[PDB]
Paper text:
EC50 values from ELISA experiments with IgGs were 1.93 and 2.64 μg/ml, and the dissociation constants (Kd) from BLI were 890 and 180 nM for Rh.33104 mAb.1 and Rh.33172 mAb.1, respectively. The final map resolutions for the Rh.33104 mAb.1 and Rh.33172 mAb.1 complexes were 3.3 and 3.5 Å, respectively. Atomic models were relaxed into the reconstructed maps. The structures revealed that both antibodies bound to the same epitopes as the pAbs computationally sorted from cryoEMPEM maps. The overlay of the maps/models from experiments with monoclonal and polyclonal Fabs showed excellent agreement in both cases. On the backbone level (Cα), the root mean square deviation values between the mAb and pAb model were 0.668 and 0.721 Å for Rh.33104 and Rh.33172 datasets, respectively.
Here, we developed a method to determine mAb sequences directly from cryoEMPEM maps. This hybrid approach, consisting of electron microscopy (EM) and next-generation sequencing (NGS), enabled sequence assignment of variable regions of polyclonal Fabs (Fv) including the complementarity-determining regions (CDRs). We used structural data from the recently published rhesus macaque immunization experiments with soluble HIV Env trimers.
Author numbering:
A (entry chain E): 521 to 546, 568 to 664
B (entry chain L): 1 to 107
C (entry chain A): 51 to 57, 66 to 141, 150 to 185, 189 to 309, 312 to 323, 323A, 324 to 397, 411 to 505
D (entry chain C): 102 to 141, 150 to 185, 188 to 203
E (entry chain H): 2 to 52, 52A, 53 to 82, 82A, 82B, 82C, 83 to 100, 100A, ...
F (entry chain B): 521 to 546, 568 to 613
G (entry chain F): 568 to 613
H (entry chain C): 463 to 504
The structure:
């Protein structure tokens, strides 16, 4: 079920992405408060979708990119991260770099688009 | 409570002179020292409210000024009608207090 | 729809959204844009939102309906100078108390401008038209800088051309999220505490030869004006109903003298000559420019109206607009004060301005004028400029003239050499 | 905090359409209820009478009612007012 | 404005005196009424003041217990009663109006203007 | 920054399309007016996205199609 | 007219929510951005 | 003396609520995240 994988390792938890995704959309004073809440849920949803589109990821729960991982963001093994750590721990571990990484993801996609402006294969 | 006192007891001056008297407040009274004129047989009247500014009907010959504790009343030109005992009062605090008055004679 | 932001004040309460420190703007190199301050809808929105703030602010305040009773009034003749003779009325009436079966006799002072004779018996001037609400004494309407900000999907373009007169192409433009702060001072004939022109006096109009249009003059120097209500007024209060207090002037201390405003005479003359020079550019440097006072109408139109310390002043500007221009001391403007105000050129919805304790003094900056031309024809080529009446919108148009709101439209197409790959 | 705020709101809205008792804030004439009172209740109830409004504006009616002393305050058979008359209107 | 005092009399030590001050020309409930005593010689002293709108009183320490004050808002008049007299109380008693201050939802605000509209003064003597 | 490319040529301007996209999704009467403004921002955003969907350009900032350019 | 305005906002927000709900499913099923999508689920005779 | 005195209190209604809501917390879900892998876009 929803958040059932919260205590699972990142590897195991990556297999439940769909259930989490499905739970994002589901008296004058009271009526305004409720409209406020509904509009915001929509706006947040759309912002995440826009970022994925900007980064070149669309319609995917798992998307690969061309940005190298920096040892300065986190110096850990693949087995360490994927098998002995949860997503909550990871999120805290690298919260300092969220904006740096996002900036790089955008730059990478922009270069990709520039490369696609060539009709020459660029080999 | 705030003690109020005056200095020039039994002051005397000639008609046409300039006459001043002073009043001192304990603590400080936010520049709210009022002055009154009391003649024998009459209810006292108000001359100056605050430390400066006249009560309507009071002649322009009267004026005053001061610091937080040191206040002065002035009569620019003494008239025969100014013989009275003058009083000063703190309208600043609740237990309103009057100081001793100072009598003015004609020389 | 724009929203406002700012850094017991109505303005601060409403424009609750914070502003950025060091807001940035983006210069748009090589962009020419067309502006028109007379068709600007930021002005219309600002006007509408201001009206709303006043109506909302007074919404929960004490209603004064119970005071619309017959008054018995006499003239105050006690220590009144000639300048003020007949201005104050000393009135009494039988008012209610918090208990419905009891009354009290109330005595108070009123300005004659608020009271009219019935057929002596008097009534408050608003009784035959509408109810009146007492403004809450703890609610401040003192203007503070307000920044108008665009919603996502929109942008505000700012015109930086130094001589821009509000209409036509602008070549130095930039994009901003919020306007500079605008202080919403409400006044009539003279504009107070606005921005100044940087290079010269700038005269802006919609149609300069059209006598039906006003002229907005922005000065490049301020003129200081010192206003006062010289007597010591004492505020008293009574209870009208459960939880409802009414404020009135009890007593005025000292000989009564008129309210007035001073401007340096030399400064006023110098900044008038500057205006004349700019007017000559449109009307000819061989014509005669004359200034004259207002033509007549309601007090709210014919005088210079402003809020000083919370009090409402109506000053006579005939002492300013009295000169002919052909190719130390202060000017004193007498003023009148009133408490029953029909604000924003509306009928009814009156407000009562509570009295203010003590002596009132304020100092303001004159930053511009609203002028009108007196009709005319070629005649003897002498034209007269009179202080205009004007809409309140004109006071906002004079600050928002450099801003435009546009919508962003992200899709477009163009030809290239590519084809769908497969 | 939300539970608190929403509760305050329900009370304020629920009383919104109810009868106002402003017409009731009148001087009352009151005596003690002394009929079969135990010692513990002496002085707790008062028998008040007053001129209340009615359906027509030109008519009045005399009303007798009982009040607890906590709701009624003496002005200075003695005269009394409701405790709230000096603070706010009181909605039924 | 006019304030009128009455009640001059001769009292024996040990009894009480009640003085009155009728007022007119102003809203009765809007101004606090002060009582001031002028002893023979000596100096003026404040005894206390009643707020005519709600009955709040405030007394000089010398007279706490000894002095009580009341108000009549139907008949616009103020009263002062000195509960137990001694020969030391021979004096002229004056009624005076504070000419400033007002009440509000937040409590009373005093602005500081002085005493005006003084009454005539009522002589009370205490001796046999 | 946002719209800094407004005076740039089309070629150069097209180099920075992301900056123009990421800036699109950022008292009873006041509250209603603000909700209406938020809703329109969303409705306009979605309308444009739907067209890209219909034209087969979903997810792209630059999309090549088969419609020929008309000299007229 | 407060009530009319709220009802209209109700209706507009809801229309958006329904639109997005269907788009999310196409995303989840791997059919994003298409009007016609082939899948790997066999059709059941039942 | 080490004797402590306790008395009835309250009156602030929020403290009554707190006795039922003490076990609940509200959080926001944040669906995006990144992590290193051996995958590269092609
Ligand atoms: C054009 O622009 C000028 C300059 O900004 C405006 O002038 C100001 O006007 C405001 C409102 O009238 C004045 O605010 C008042 O200040 C009083 C204190 O004054 C002393 O301290 C200041 C400290 O900054 C000194 O500058 C000043 O010289 C004095 O020494 C306060 O006591 C006032 O309080 C009132 O409101 C509060 C509300 O909570 C009540 O509790 C108080 O009892 C009282 O009623 C008030 O805050 C301001 O001082 C003026 N500035 C100057 C330099 O004079 C013009 O008003 C504006 N023109 C127009 C038309 O709007
Ligand atoms: C009005 O009343 C005030 C007092 O409330 C007077 O203020 C005094 O004025 C003098 C002269 O400058 C100052 O030295 C005092 O400090 C002021 N009093 C206070 C409270 O500081 C004022 O002069 C009166 N004005 C008129 C014209 O009546
Ligand atoms: C009224 O005009 C004066 C100038 O005549 C303004 O005061 C100056 O403001 C500038 C702002 O850049 C400062 O650098 C100067 O030092 C100020 N001069 C003095 C003498 O202080 C004043 O701010 C204007 N008032 C209003 C309300 O706009
Ligand atoms: C406006 O100017 C007048 C003078 O034209 C000022 O009045 C004078 O004030 C001085 C004190 O500074 C007195 O000695 C003079 O007797 C007054 N003159 C007259 C004719 O009464 C007045 O105070 C100024 N007002 C303002 C707001 O600045
Ligand atoms: C308005 O009032 C200000 C004071 O608040 C006046 O400015 C002062 O003028 C004197 C000369 O009379 C100078 O010595 C002071 O240095 C000035 N003070 C400040 C702060 O500038 C000003 O002149 C008055 N304006 C008008 C038109 O009357
Ligand atoms: C409150 O006062 C009323 C008025 O005196 C009482 O009602 C009267 O009771 C007597 C019997 O004792 C009857 O004969 C009268 O006809 C009644 N009069 C009216 C107008 O109703 C009432 O009983 C008192 N209530 C209490 C609790 O003491
Ligand atoms: C306002 O009007 C009232 C009367 O309605 C005046 O009150 C009178 O004042 C004189 C002394 O000034 C007394 O002798 C009278 O007995 C008072 N009459 C009443 C009915 O109280 C009051 O003085 C007037 N105030 C002003 C400034 O003119
Ligand atoms: C909790 O840790 C144990 C370790 O033996 C593991 O078997 C279990 O699956 C973990 N729980 C979750 C939700 O992953
Ligand atoms: C990222 O890698 C670069 C080298 O390519 C290094 O200089 C930099 O310090 C690293 N981390 C951060 C947070 O910049
Ligand atoms: C960066 O990491 C340190 C701990 O090493 C932390 O204290 C700081 O708040 C973090 N900064 C941000 C922006 O997360
Ligand atoms: C009050 O002023 C008016 C001004 O028109 C005058 O006609 C009237 O006689 C004056 N009344 C008194 C009592 O002075
Ligand atoms: C107030 O009521 C009395 C009767 O109680 C009446 O004689 C007087 O004229 C009324 N005064 C006013 C100002 O209405
Ligand atoms: C109210 O009375 C004034 C004064 O007589 C008059 O000028 C005005 O037209 C009247 N208003 C109405 C609505 O009749
Ligand atoms: C635009 O700004 C530059 C300074 O950056 C200035 O030299 C130029 O004259 C300005 N253009 C106009 C039309 O004012
Ligand atoms: C000034 O106004 C005229 C119209 O009266 C307009 O044609 C011109 O573009 C405006 N701007 C400047 C800088 O002259
Ligand atoms: C205003 O413009 C005139 C133009 O003649 C100039 O002489 C004056 O110095 C300018 N004033 C300021 C403050 O720029
Ligand atoms: C300017 O005003 C004149 C009236 O004198 C009018 O004939 C002319 O058409 C107006 N200009 C414009 C652009 O409307
Ligand atoms: C006066 O008007 C003429 C046009 O007739 C113009 O050429 C000249 O520059 C203007 N100004 C002066 C100072 O002559
Ligand atoms: C304008 O001035 C004249 C005197 O020259 C005066 O009669 C007229 O009433 C004034 N206008 C206004 C609106 O006061
Ligand atoms: C303005 O002052 C003039 C001085 O001659 C006077 O005649 C006129 O009536 C006054 N106007 C106003 C509205 O006060
Ligand atoms: C206008 O100026 C003349 C002197 O040229 C003077 O006599 C007249 O009174 C002035 N008008 C006003 C309203 O002050
Ligand atoms: C303004 O002052 C100058 C002197 O510098 C004087 O010649 C001129 O006549 C004055 N202005 C008016 C309208 O009189
Ligand atoms: C009501 O009870 C009080 C108890 O203190 C008593 O003083 C009062 O006289 C009683 N009143 C009547 C009408 O019995
Ligand atoms: C009711 O009103 C009449 C006057 O009409 C009065 O005599 C009587 O005392 C009042 N009764 C009560 C209980 O208030
Ligand atoms: C109302 O009357 C009660 C009587 O007990 C008193 O305690 C309270 O302070 C009064 N409130 C006001 C606003 O006068
Ligand atoms: C404006 O034109 C110049 C022409 O040399 C060009 O170098 C500059 O980049 C252009 N500005 C923009 C924003 O493209
Ligand atoms: C498009 O091309 C066709 C020929 O294929 C031509 O007939 C038509 O006029 C052109 N333009 C438009 C707007 O249809
Ligand atoms: C789908 O087919 C299987 C056999 O392959 C069958 O057991 C199952 O019941 C069918 N689905 C449904 C809904 O009947």
């Amino acid at each position: 079920g929803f958040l059932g994988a919260a205590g699972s390792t990142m590897g195991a938890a990556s297999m439940t992405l769909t259930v989490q995704a499905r739970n994002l959309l589901s008296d004058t004073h009271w009526g305004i408060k409720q409209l406020q809440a509904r509009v915001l849920a929509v706006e947040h949803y759309l912002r995440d979708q826009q970022l994925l589109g900007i980064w070149g990821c669309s319609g995917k729960l798992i998307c690969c990119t061309n940005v190298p991982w920096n040892s300065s963001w986190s110096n850990r093994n693949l087995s360490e991260i994927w098998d002995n750590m949860t997503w909550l721990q990871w999120d805290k571990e690298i919260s300092n770099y969220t904006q740096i990484i996002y900036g790089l993801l955008e730059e990478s996609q922009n270069q990709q688009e520039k490369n696609e402006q060539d009709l020459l294969e660029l080999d | 409570d705030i003690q109020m006192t005056q200095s020039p007891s039994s002051l005397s001056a000639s008609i046409g002179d300039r006459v001043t008297v002073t009043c001192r407040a304990s603590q400080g009274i936010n520049m709210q020292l009022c002055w009154y004129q009391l003649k024998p047989g009459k209810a006292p009247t108000l001359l100056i409210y605050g430390t400066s500014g006249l009560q309507t009907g009071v002649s322009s010959r009267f004026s005053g000024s001061g610091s937080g504790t040191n206040f002065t009343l002035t009569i620019s030109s003494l008239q025969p009608e100014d013989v009275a005992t003058y009083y000063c009062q703190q309208d600043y605090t609740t237990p309103f207090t009057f100081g001793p008055g100072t009598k003015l004679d004609i020389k | 729809t724009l929203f406002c932001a700012s850094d017991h004040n109505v303005w601060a309460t409403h424009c609750c959204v914070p502003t950025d420190p060091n807001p940035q703007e983006i210069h748009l190199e090589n962009v020419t844009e067309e502006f028109n301050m007379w068709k600007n809808n930021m002005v219309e929105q600002m006007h509408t939102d201001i009206i709303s703030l006043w109506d909302q602010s007074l919404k929960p305040c004490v209603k004064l309906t119970p005071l619309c009773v017959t008054l018995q009034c006499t003239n105050v003749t006690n220590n009144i100078t000639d300048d003020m003779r007949g201005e104050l009325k000393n009135c009494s009436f039988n008012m209610t108390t918090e208990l419905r079966d009891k009354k009290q006799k109330v005595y108070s002072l009123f300005y004659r401008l608020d009271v009219v004779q019935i057929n002596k018996e008097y009534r408050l001037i608003n009784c035959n038209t509408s109810a009146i609400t007492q403004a809450c004494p703890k609610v401040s309407f003192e203007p503070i800088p307000i920044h108008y900000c665009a919603p996502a999907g929109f942008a505000i373009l700012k015109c930086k051309d130094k001589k821009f007169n509000g209409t036509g192409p602008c070549t130095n433009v930039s994009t901003v999220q919020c306007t500079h702060g605008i202080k919403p001072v409400v006044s009539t004939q003279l504009l107070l505490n606005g921005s100044l022109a940087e290079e010269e006096v700038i005269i802006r109009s919609e149609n300069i030869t059209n006598n039906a249009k006003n002229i907005l003059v922005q000065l490049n120097e301020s003129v200081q004006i010192n206003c006062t209500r010289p007597n010591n007024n004492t505020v008293k209060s009574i209870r009208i109903g459960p939880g409802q207090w009414f404020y009135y002037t009890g007593d005025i201390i000292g000989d009564i003298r008129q309210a007035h405003c001073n401007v340096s005479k030399a400064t006023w003359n110098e900044t008038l000559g500057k205006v004349v020079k700019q007017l000559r550019k449109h009307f000819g440097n061989n014509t005669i420019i004359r200034f004259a006072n207002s033509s007549g109408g309601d007090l709210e139109v014919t005088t210079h109206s402003f809020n000083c310390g919370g009090e409402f002043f109506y000053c006579n500007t005939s002492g300013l607009f009295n000169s002919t221009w052909i190719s130390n001391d202060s000017i004193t403007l007498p003023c009148r004060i009133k408490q029953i105000i029909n604000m924003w050129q509306r009928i009814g919805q009156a407000m009562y301005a509570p009295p203010i304790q003590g002596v009132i003094r304020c100092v303001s900056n004159i930053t511009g004028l609203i002028l009108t031309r007196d009709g005319g024809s070629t005649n003897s080529t002498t034209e007269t400029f009179r202080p205009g009446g004007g809409d309140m919108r004109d006071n906002w148009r004079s600050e928002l003239y450099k801003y435009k709101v546009v919508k962003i439209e992200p899709l477009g197409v163009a030809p290239t050499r590519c084809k769908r790959r497969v | 905090e939300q539970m608190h705020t929403d509760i305050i709101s329900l009370w304020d809205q629920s009383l919104k359409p109810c009868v106002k008792l402003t017409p009731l804030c009148v001087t009352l004439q009151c005596t003690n209820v002394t009929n079969n009172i135990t010692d513990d209740m002496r002085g707790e109830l008062k028998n008040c009478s007053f001129n209340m409004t009615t359906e027509l504006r030109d008519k009045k009616q005399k009303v007798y009612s009982l009040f607890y002393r906590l709701d009624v305050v003496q002005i200075n058979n003695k005269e009394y007012r409701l405790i709230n008359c000096n603070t706010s209107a009181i909605t039924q | 404005v006019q304030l009128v005092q009455s009640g001059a009399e001769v009292k024996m030590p040990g009894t009480s005196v009640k003085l009155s001050c009728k007022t007119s020309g102003y809203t009765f409930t809007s101004y606090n009424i002060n009582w001031v005593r002028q002893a023979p010689g000596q100096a003026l002293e404040w005894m206390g003041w009643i707020n005519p709108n709600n009955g709040t009183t405030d007394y000089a320490q010398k007279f706490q217990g000894r002095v009580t004050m009341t108000r009549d808002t139907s008949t616009t008049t103020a009263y002062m009663q000195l509960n137990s007299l001694r020969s030391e109380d021979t004096a002229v008693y004056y009624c005076a109006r504070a000419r400033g201050g007002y009440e509000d939802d937040d409590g009373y605000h005093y602005t500081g203007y002085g005493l005006d509209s003084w009454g005539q003064g009522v002589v009370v003597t205490v001796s046999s």
